Write a protein that binds this ligand. Structure first.
Ligand SMILES: Nc1ncnc2c1ncn2[C@@H]1O[C@H](COP(=O)(O)OP(=O)(O)OP(=O)(O)O)[C@@H](O)[C@H]1O
Ligand SMILES: Nc1ncnc2c1ncn2[C@@H]1O[C@H](COP(=O)(O)OP(=O)(O)O)[C@@H](O)[C@H]1O
Ligand SMILES: [Mg+2]
Ligand SMILES: [Zn+2]
Ligand SMILES: [Zn+2]
Lengths: 420, 663
C-alpha cells in the first residue's frame, strides 16, 4: 500500500526458529547468493500475496540484515574472517563524491552507424571484434560512446574506530567503506554509526604499467545496512497559563541559584524579536546582543554552555571567527570556507573570554553588528555573506576583583563604542 | 654452467634422524606425538620445536656407538631448509583425529571435497601440501645451562646489538636485544593463490613465496587446452590460503651505543600465530632467522651486489615488567594484610618516596593525596565533578623540585613529563600526524599526550608559549579539547591531574607583595589550582647542616644510605595505591554543617584579603570544592567507605600550611 521497496531483517527473530538457524549459518558463510535468492523470493511474494502487478514489475527488492554478529573492533581482524558478515561501529572521518560505475557498455559500428548493448561482468568488458551486421562485417568499425552508457553510483566512506577500544593511549585505525544506491550520502562527517556487512580483500596494482602484483592485499568492507549510534495542543495548554513566564525563565538553568533577572533577559533574547525588510527604508536589526561581566566566581561559563545546547542553532567558541579561503589538506584544490559567525544565522552565537579578542577580529565584530553582512575580497573572490546572528558574550575584569569604586570601562578593557 | 663442490652435509640421514627423533622421543608417552594429536583434533594452531631436546637426545644416544653426526650445528648454520624438512616430516607422521570435528565450518575442506567429488568421480589433482596444512612451525633457541651440561660449545643465544650483526650472520639463527619503537597493523599475506576456470574441470592453483606476484593467462583445462578459448580464468578469494603479516623495527639501547655514534635500526618480519605479541616501547629478546632481501623492489637498477636485510621472528621474550591492573592474587592479599597490620601508612609512604631529597614532608603528603585522587563519578542531574587534583609548586632554583617531580613520574605509571616546545608533537597535535608512509593524515584533532586519566608533569611552567598555555587552560576541570582544523571533532576526553613547578622571573623571593611574584600567569589560571605550595630557601645553620650531612653521606656510600628508615618499598606503594583506589570510600553527610561553617570562616578570611602583602586569600568556590575533594581523598587513602571530620580538619590544616609559606 506504500510502494516502498525496503525490508529490514533482524537475526535474533530469524534465530527464534529451528529451521531458520541453518539458513542463518549458511548466510554467514555465503551472504551474496543467499541475499540474491531472498530478494527473488520477496519479488515473487508480491504476486503470491496480491492473489496490481504493474508497480511490481518496475521496482526491485532488497533486504537489510542487522544484528547478525557482535560488534567487533578493527584491532582484531584475522584473515579467517574474509567474506563473512560482520557488525562494526565507528565514526565517519571523510566522504567522497559519487563515483560512476559501468554496467552497460555502448558500442557503435561507425561505418553503418549500427549500435548494440553489451552486458559486462566483473568489470572486464569482452569487446566484440566484428559487427553483428554481416552485410558489412567489418572488424575495426566499433568505437564506444562514453555518454550513452549506463552507470551505477558507488561511494567510498572512510571510518575510524570508536575511542572506547583504545585503553592505553594508542592511536585509532581507519577502515574504508563502500556503498551503493540508497546508502549514498546516508552519512556525513562526524557521524556515529554502526554498520553490518561482509569483508573483502583485493590485490593492489602497484605499477600501473605492468601486470605485477604485491604480496599484500588491501582490506575493505562492503555493507548493506547502516544505523546511527499533533503536539500543538500541548503548547496552547501550557501557553495559556499565567505564571508560565517565571517557570520558563527558571527552567533554563536548574542549578543556578537566584540570578532571576539575568535569566529572564537571556530567555527573552533566545525568544528574539521580529525582523522586517521594508523596501523604501531598508532592513532593521532583529537580533539581541547581551554582555555579562564579573569576577570568575560566578559559573558564568555554565550559562553559555546551557544556552549553546538549548538553542536550535548556535556556535560556542572562545577568544578565525569568519570566512577565510583555506588550502585543502587531503585534496589539492582551493575551497572557500565560511566562519563560525556565518554558521550562526538566525541563532545565538556564544563568545567566551571576550577581553582576549586581539585587535584584528574586533573590527570584524564592529561590522557584523551594525550591518549584519560581511564581505570578503581575497584571491580574486569578491562577495558578501549574510550573518543575522545574536551575540552573548562574557568578560572578566582586570585584577583579582572588580572594585566597585572604579567604573566599568577600565576594568573590562573594551572599546567604548563596542560596549555602547 | 655451474661448477660443483663437495660438502659433508647430506639430507637423507638428517631426515631419517629427524623422523626417528620425532617418533621415539621421550621427555603421557612421547611428547611429540601428543602435540601432533592435539593438532590433528584442530586444537593446537602452532608447533614449537626446542633445540635443547634435540641436543640432549643426541647426547644421551651417543652413549651407543650408532650416532655419527650432530643436527643442532646444521640447524645453527642453516635454518630455512630445516623448516621444510620438519614440515615434511610432520605431514608424513600426522596421526588420525581422536576427537569429533565440527566439519561443516571448514569451508575450505568443503570446497575441496566438492572439487574431489567432481573430479575423482570421473576417475583429479594432487594439491600442494601447504594448502592442506593448518599449523605453524616455530623454533626456540637453546638455553645456556644445557650447553654447560656438556663440553661442546653449542651456545647460540647471546643477544648481540643491532650494529654487532655483520654480513657473516646471514642465514643463521641469532638473538637480538633492543627497544621496539614502530609496530604496523595486521594485514593478510598470500601463500597459495587459486584461480577458477569457468566450470572447466580442475581449478588451477599456484604458490608464490616471492614478495612480487604475476598472474596466469591461460589454463591447463582440457576443454580450455582445446584449440579455442573456453572462459577466462579468474582469481578466487575463497579457495586461496592466506596468512597474517606484520612488520616492525627495533632500535639499539643507549647503553650499547659507542661514544660519538648514532644508533642503528633493524627490520623484523613476523607471520603466523605470534602476530601482535609485542607492543611499541618495550625491551625484548627476539630470536629469528637473519635473511637477505632483494633491492629489486625499489626498481632503481643500481647496487648490483648490494642488498637489504631483515630478520624473521621465531620466538619473542617480552621481558620488561607487567602492570597487571592490580589483578588479585593470594600473595598480594597477604601483602595487603601486612599493610593492614602496619597501622598508619601514609606517613611512611611520604618518607619512602624520595629519601634522596631531604625534608619537605608536607609536599610529600600532598603528593600522596594527589596520587589517590578526589571525589569523582559525577553527582545528581548531570553536574560534572572530577576526582583529579591540581597542585602547583613554587620555589627558587636548587630546591630539588625537579628531582621530586622525576621521582613522582617514576612512581606513577601514568605520569608524563612535558615542557614548553623542545618537542613539538606533545601538545595540540596527535603523535600520528603525517606518520604513515602513505601519508594518510591520521589525526584526532585537538588532543594531548595520554590526557585520559594521566598525570601531566611540567617544569618551567612560565616558559610555555601561548599554544600550550591555551591547552592547559582547555584541559581545566575535565573539559574536553575540541580544537578543529579540517572538520575533525574527535575530542579527547581529558580527565587528568595537573602537577607543575615554576619559579618567579627574579629567581628569588621578594619582600614586596607576594602576588607581584605570583606565577607571572593570569590569575584565572592560578585560581583553578587546588593547592599552592611555596618553597622559600632560608639560610640557617641548623637545617643546612642536616642537608649537607645528608647529601655528603649519600655521596660517600654511592647509594641510598641506611640512615634512611623506610619500612615500605616503591613496588609496595605501587601495589597499595591501586589497592586503596579500589576501595573507593564515598561521602558521608554528617560533615556538611562543619564544612559550611569552615567555608564561612574562609569568607571571613576573604574579608581580610585587602590587608595585602599575602593577598592570595581570595574568595573562590573552587576553594570549597577543593576542600571537599581533599577530604574525600583523605578518606580514600586509608579509610574504609566513610569520610571523617578528621579528614576535613586535615584538609584545613594542609590549606593553612600551604598559605603559611608566604610569610
Ligand atoms: N633537599 C634536597 N636534598 C638533596 N639534594 C637537594 C635538595 N634540594 C636540592 N638538592 C640538589 O639540587 C639539585 C636538583 O635541584 P634543581 O636545581 O635541579 O631543581 P629546581 O629547583 O627545579 O631548579 P632548576 O629550575 O634550576 O633546575 C640536585 O643536585 C640535588 O642534589
Ligand atoms: N552561583 C553558583 N552556583 C554554582 N556554582 C558556582 C556558582 N558560582 C561559582 N560557581 C563555581 O565556581 C566556578 C566559577 O567559574 P567561572 O566564573 O565560570 O570561570 P570563567 O568565568 O573564568 O569560565 C564554576 O566552575 C562553578 O562550579
Ligand atoms: Mg628546575
Ligand atoms: Zn557495420
Ligand atoms: Zn575454461
Amino acid at each position: 500500500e506504500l510502494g516502498t521497496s525496503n525490508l529490514n531483517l533482524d537475526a535474533r527473530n530469524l534465530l527464534a526458529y529451528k529451521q531458520t538457524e541453518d539458513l542463518y549459518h549458511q548466510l554467514l558463510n555465503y551472504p551474496q547468493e543467499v541475499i540474491s535468492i531472498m530478494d527473488q523470493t520477496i519479488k515473487d511474494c508480491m504476486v503470491s500475496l496480491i492473489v496490481d502487478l504493474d508497480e511490481i514489475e518496475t521496482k526491485f527488492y532488497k533486504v537489510r540484515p542487522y544484528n547478525v554478529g557482535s560488534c567487533k573492533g578493527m584491532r582484531e581482524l584475522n584473515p579467517n574472517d574474509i567474506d563473512k558478515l560482520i557488525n562494526l561501529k565507528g565514526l565517519v572521518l571523510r566522504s567522497t563524491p559519487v563515483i560512476p560505475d559501468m554496467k552497460v557498455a555502448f558500442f557503435k559500428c561507425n561505418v553503418c552507424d549500427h549500435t548494440m548493448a553489451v552486458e559486462i561482468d566483473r568489470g572486464v568488458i569482452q569487446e566484440p571484434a566484428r559487427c553483428e551486421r554481416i552485410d558489412c562485417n567489418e572488424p575495426n568499425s566499433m568505437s564506444l560512446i562514453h555518454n550513452r552508457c549506463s552507470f551505477a553510483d558507488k561511494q567510498v566512506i572512510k571510518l575510524q574506530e570508536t575511542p572506547d577500544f583504545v585503553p592505553d593511549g594508542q592511536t585509532p585505525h581507519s577502515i574504508s567503506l563502500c556503498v551503493y544506491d540508497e546508502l549514498v550520502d546516508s552519512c556525513r562527517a562526524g557521524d556515529r554509526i554502526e554498520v553490518t556487512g561482509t569483508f573483502r580483500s583485493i590485490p593492489i596494482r602497484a605499477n600501473s604499467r605492468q601486470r605485477v602484483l604485491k604480496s599484500l592485499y588491501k582490506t575493505y568492507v562492503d555493507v548493506v545496512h547502516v544505523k546511527k549510534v499533533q503536539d500543538l495542543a500541548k503548547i496552547r495548554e501550557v501557553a495559556a497559563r499565567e505564571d508560565l513566564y517565571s517557570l520558563l525563565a527558571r527552567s533554563i538553568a536548574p542549578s543556578i541559584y537566584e540570578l532571576e533577572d539575568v535569566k529572564k533577559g537571556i530567555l527573552l533574547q533566545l525568544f528574539g524579536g521580529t525582523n522586517k525588510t521594508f523596501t523604501k527604508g531598508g532592513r532593521y536589526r532583529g537580533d539581541i546582543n547581551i554582555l555579562l561581566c564579573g569576577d570568575p566566581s560566578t559559573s558564568k561559563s555554565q550559562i553559555l554552555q546551557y544556552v549553546h545546547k538549548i538553542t536550535p542553532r548556535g556556535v560556542y567558541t572562545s577568544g578565525g571567527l569568519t570566512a577565510y579561503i583555506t588550502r585543502d589538506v587531503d585534496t589539492k584544490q582551493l575551497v572557500l570556507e565560511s566562519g563560525a559567525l556565518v554558521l550562526s544565522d538566525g541563532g545565538v552565537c556564544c563568545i567566551d573570554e571576550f577581553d582576549k579578542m586581539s585587535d584584528s577580529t574586533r573590527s570584524v565584530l564592529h561590522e557584523v553588528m551594525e550591518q549584519q553582512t560581511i564581505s570578503i575580497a581575497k584571491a580574486g573572490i569578491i562577495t558578501t555573506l549574510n550573518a543575522r546572528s545574536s551575540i552573548l558574550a562574557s568578560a572578566n575584569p582586570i585584577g583579582s576583583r572588580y572594585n566597585p569604586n572604579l567604573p566599568v570601562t577600565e576594568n573590562i578593557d573594551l572599546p567604548p563604542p563596542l560596549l555602547s | 654452467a655451474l661448477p660443483s663442490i663437495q660438502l659433508p652435509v647430506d639430507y637423507n640421514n638428517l631426515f631419517n634422524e629427524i623422523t626417528d627423533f620425532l617418533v621415539t622421543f621421550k621427555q603421557k608417552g612421547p611428547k611429540y606425538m601428543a602435540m601432533l594429536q592435539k593438532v590433528a583434533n584442530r586444537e593446537l594452531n602452532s608447533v614449537i620445536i626446542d633445540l635443547d631436546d634435540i641436543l640432549q637426545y643426541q647426547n644421551e644416544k651417543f652413549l651407543q656407538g650408532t650416532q655419527a653426526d650432530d643436527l643442532v650445528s646444521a640447524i645453527q648454520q642453516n635454518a630455512n631448509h630445516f623448516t621444510e624438512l620438519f614440515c615434511r616430516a610432520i605431514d608424513n607422521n600426522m596421526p588420525l583425529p581422536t576427537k569429533e570435528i565440527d566439519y561443516k565450518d571448514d569451508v575450505l575442506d568443503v570446497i575441496l571435497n566438492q572439487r574431489r567429488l567432481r573430479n575423482e568421480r570421473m576417475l583429479t589433482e594432487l594439491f600442494p601440501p601447504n594448502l592442506t596444512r593448518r599449523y605453524f612451525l616455530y623454533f626456540k633457541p637453546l638455553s645456556q645451562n644445557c650447553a654447560r651440561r656438556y663440553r661442546k660449545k653449542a651456545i647460540s643465544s647471546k643477544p648481540l646489538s643491532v650494529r654487532q650483526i655483520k654480513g657473516d650472520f646471514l642465514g643463521q639463527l641469532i638473538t637480538v636485544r633492543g627497544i621496539i619503537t614502530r609496530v604496523s597493523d595486521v594485514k593478510p599475506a598470500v601463500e597459495v593463490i587459486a584461480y577458477t576456470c569457468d566450470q572447466c574441470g580442475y581449478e588451477v592453483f599456484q604458490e608464490v613465496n616471492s614478495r612480487t606476484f604475476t598472474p596466469l593467462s591461460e589454463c591447463t583445462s582440457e576443454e580450455c587446452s582445446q584449440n579455442q578459448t573456453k572462459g577466462q580464468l579468474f582469481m578466487s578469494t575463497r579457495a586461496s590460503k592466506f596468512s597474517a603479516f606484520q612488520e616492525c623495527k627495533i632500535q639499539e639501547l643507549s647503553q650499547q651505543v659507542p661514544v660519538g655514534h648514532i644508533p642503528r635500526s633493524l627490520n623484523i618480519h613476523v607471520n603466523g600465530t605470534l602476530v601482535r605479541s609485542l607492543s611499541p616501547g618495550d625491551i625484548v629478546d627476539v630470536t629469528g632467522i637473519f635473511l637477505p632481501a632483494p633491492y629489486t623492489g625499489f626498481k632503481a637498477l643500481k647496487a648490483g651486489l648490494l642488498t637489504e636485510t631483515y630478520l624473521e621472528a621465531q620466538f619473542v621474550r617480552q621481558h620488561k615488567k607487567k602492570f597487571a591492573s592490580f589483578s588479585l592474587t593470594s600473595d598480594v592479599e597477604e601483602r595487603v594484610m601486612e599493610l593492614i597490620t602496619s597501622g598508619d601508612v601514609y606517613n611512611r609512604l611520604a618518607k619512602s618516596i624520595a629519601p634522596e631529597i631531604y625534608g619537605n614532608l608536607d609536599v610529600k603528603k600532598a603528593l600522596l593525596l594527589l596520587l589517590v585522587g578526589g571525589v569523582d563519578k559525577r553527582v545528581g542531574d548531570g553536574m560534572k565533578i572530577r576526582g583529579d587534583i591540581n597542585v602547583c609548586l613554587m620555589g627558587d632554583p636548587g630546591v630539588a623540585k625537579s628531582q621530586l617531580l622525576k621521582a613522582i613520574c617514576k612512581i606513577s605509571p601514568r605520569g608524563v613529563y612535558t615542557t614548553g616546545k623542545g618537542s613539538s608533537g606533545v601538545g595540540l597535535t596527535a603523535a600520528v600526524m603525517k606518520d604513515p608512509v602513505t601519508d594518510e593524515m591520521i589525526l584526532e584533532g585537538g588532543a594531548l599526550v595520554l590526557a585520559d586519566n594521566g598525570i601531566c608533569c611540567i617544569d618551567e611552567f612560565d616558559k610555555m608559549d601561548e599554544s600550550d598555555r591555551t591547552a592547559i587552560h582547555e584541559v581545566m576541570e575535565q573539559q574536553t579539547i575540541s580544537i578543529s582544523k579540517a572538520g575533525i571533532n574527535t575530542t579527547l576526553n581529558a580527565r587528568t591531574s595537573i602537577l607543575a613547578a615554576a619559579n618567579p622571573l627574579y629567581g628569588r623571593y621578594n619582600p614586596r607583595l607576594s602576588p607581584l611574584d605570583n606565577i607571572n600567569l593570569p590569575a584565572a589560571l592560578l585560581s583553578r589550582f587546588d593547592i599552592l605550595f611555596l618553597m622559600l630557601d632560608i639560610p640557617s645553620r641548623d637545617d643546612d647542616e642536616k642537608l649537607a650531612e645528608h647529601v655528603t653521606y649519600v655521596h660517600m656510600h654511592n647509594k641510598q644510605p641506611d640512615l634512611d628508615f623506610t619500612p615500605v618499598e616503591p613496588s609496595k606503594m605501587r601495589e597499595y595505591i591501586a589497592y586503596a583506589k579500589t576501595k573507593r570510600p564515598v561521602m558521608s553527610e554528617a560533615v556538611n554543617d562543619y564544612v559550611v561553617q569552615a567555608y564561612i570562616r574562609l569568607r571571613q578570611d576573604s574579608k581580610r584579603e585587602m590587608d595585602s602583602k599575602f593577598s592570595f586569600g581570595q574568595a573562590t568556590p573552587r576553594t570549597l570544592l577543593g576542600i571537599i575533594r581533599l577530604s574525600q581523598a583523605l578518606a580514600k587513602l586509608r579509610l574504609a567507605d566513610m569520610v571523617d571530620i578528621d579528614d576535613v580538619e586535615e584538609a584545613l590544616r594542609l590549606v593553612r600550611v600551604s598559605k603559611e609559606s608566604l610569610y
